């Protein structure tokens, strides 16, 4: 009982931390690709004002 | 009559105790094969969450 303790303060929802590693992989890949987006808008801008 | 006293404080239900005998084999077996089980159900998951 005491050990089922602990696991209850370590309990890895193992599932739910390999989700939601997943979901910040994605995110983080998401918000690089927009600063991409964020160094190409001012380019556009170099060439339509030059 | 004294032996038989004796015997009595000594009296070995011989069928009872071969009977008991077989059924803690009997359930030590059954409650290992279920140690391997909760031995198996956790690859399982590793193998559903990788």
Do not use: C, G, H, W
């Amino acid at each position: 009982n005491l050990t089922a303790a602990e696991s209850r303060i370590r309990d890895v929802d193992m599932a739910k931390e390999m989700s939601e590693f997943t979901k910040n992989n994605i995110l983080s890949q998401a918000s690089q690709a927009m600063l991409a987006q964020a160094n190409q808008q001012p380019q556009n801008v170099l060439q339509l004002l030059r």
